[PDB]
Amino acid sequence: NVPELIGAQAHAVNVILDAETAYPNLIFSDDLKSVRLGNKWERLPDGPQRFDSCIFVLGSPSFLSGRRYWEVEVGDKTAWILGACKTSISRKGNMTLSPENGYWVVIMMKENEYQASSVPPTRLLIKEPPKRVGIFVDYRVGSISFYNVTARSHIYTFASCSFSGPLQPIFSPGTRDGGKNTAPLTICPVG
Numbered sequence: 001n002v003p004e005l006i007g008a009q010a011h012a013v014n015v016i017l018d019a020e021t022a023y024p025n026l027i028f029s030d031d032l033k034s035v036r037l038g039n040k041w042e043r044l045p046d047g048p049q050r051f052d053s054c055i056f057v058l059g060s061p062s063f064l065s066g067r068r069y070w071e072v073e074v075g076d077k078t079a080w081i082l083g084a085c086k087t088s089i090s091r092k093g094n095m096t097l098s099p100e101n102g103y104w105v106v107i108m109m110k111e112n113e114y115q116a117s118s119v120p121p122t123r124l125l126i127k128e129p130p131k132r133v134g135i136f137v138d139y140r141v142g143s144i145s146f147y148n149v150t151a152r153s154h155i156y157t158f159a160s161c162s163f164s165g166p167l168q169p170i171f172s173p174g175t176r177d178g179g180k181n182t183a184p185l186t187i188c189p190v191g
Contacts, residue, residue: 001141002143002145002154002157002159003136003145005134005147005149005152005153005154008067008069008134008136008145008147009069009134009190010069011066011067011068011069011136012069012070012071012189012190013061013063013068013069013070015059015060015061015070015169015187016031016032016033016059016060016187017032017033017034017035017057017058017059017060017171017187018032018057018058018059018060019032019044019057020047020049020050021049021050021051021056021057021058021091022035022044022050022051022056022057022058023050023051023052023054023055023056023057024043024044024046024050025037025038025039025040025042025043025044025055026038026044026055026057026173027042027184029184029186033186033187033188034184034185034186034187035057035171035173035184035185036173036182036183036184036185037055037173037174037175037176037181037182049091050091051091051092052091052092052093053092053093053094054091054093054094054172055172055173055174055175056081056091056170056171056172057170057171057172058085058168058169058170058171059168059169059170059171059187060168060169061168062087062166062167062168063137063139063166063167063168064139064163064165064166064167065139065140066139066140067136067137067138067139068136068137068139069134069135069136069137069190070134070135070169070187071132071133071134071135071149071187071188071189071190072132072133072135072171072185072186072187072188073131073132073185073186073187073188074108074130074131074132074133074185075131075183075186076131076183077108077173077174077181077183077185078108078110078111078174078177078180078181079107079108079109079110079173079174079175079177079181080107080108080171080172080173080174080185081097081105081106081107081108081170081171081172081174082105082106082133082135082146082170082171082172082185083103083104083105083106083117083135083144083146083169083170084104084105084135084137084144084167084168084169084170085102085103085104085105085167085168085170086102086103086165086166086167087165087166087167087168088102088165089101089102089103096119097117098117098118098119099117099118099119099158099161100119103117103170104117104144104158104161105117105170106124106133106146106155106156107121108174112126112129114126114155116146116155116156116158118158122156124155124156126148126155127151128148128150128151128153129150130148130149130150130151130155131149131150132148132149132150132188133146133147133148133149133155134146134147134148134149135147135169137167139163139167141159142159142160142161142162142163143157143158143159143160143161144157144158144161145157171185172185173185
């Protein structure tokens with residue numbers, strides 16, 4: 001039982017970026033709705049709580065109940081990661097992104113190359129590139145679904161996730177890619 005997009009949207013929540021968790025070269029909008037990768041010398045004040053190797057930032061709030069939906073503009077970017085993760089993940093190191101390791105994400109590897117972070121990863125057959133991606137967590141059921149909002153179509157669902165403890169959003173705007181992927185991810189209101 002995976003919702004149709006319009007169903008999932010009914011559970012729209014208000015996510016903001018936690019800049020203090022963030023990989024040090026990530027740059028943010030004042031409203032903490034947008035994040036982009038800056039230059040090696042554009043840097044946040046350092047702390048032991050930051051990602052050190054993965055270009056990640058976590059969203060707030062964490063949650064451990066209900067149905068939760070949010071949407072992110074990815075636009076014409078060539079690379080990104082979007083989904084949710086256990087609040088307990090380590091931020092030191094490229095831990096492999098997997099349900100087992102507490103990560104449910106979809107990744108754009110490059111133009112025309114998208115995978116769900118199953119293990120092994122599932123190559124998704126995406127016909128219309130999403131300009132906007134929807135994430136829907138049903139905590140009680142143990143499901144997280146990904147939507148192509150642009151096309152109004154379902155991309156992928158992880159089911160029987162058996163969630164325990166709090167989940168939160170996670171985001172990567174990818175590496176710079178010669179200047180073709182400098183655009184940010186932007187958390188957007190439904191509409």
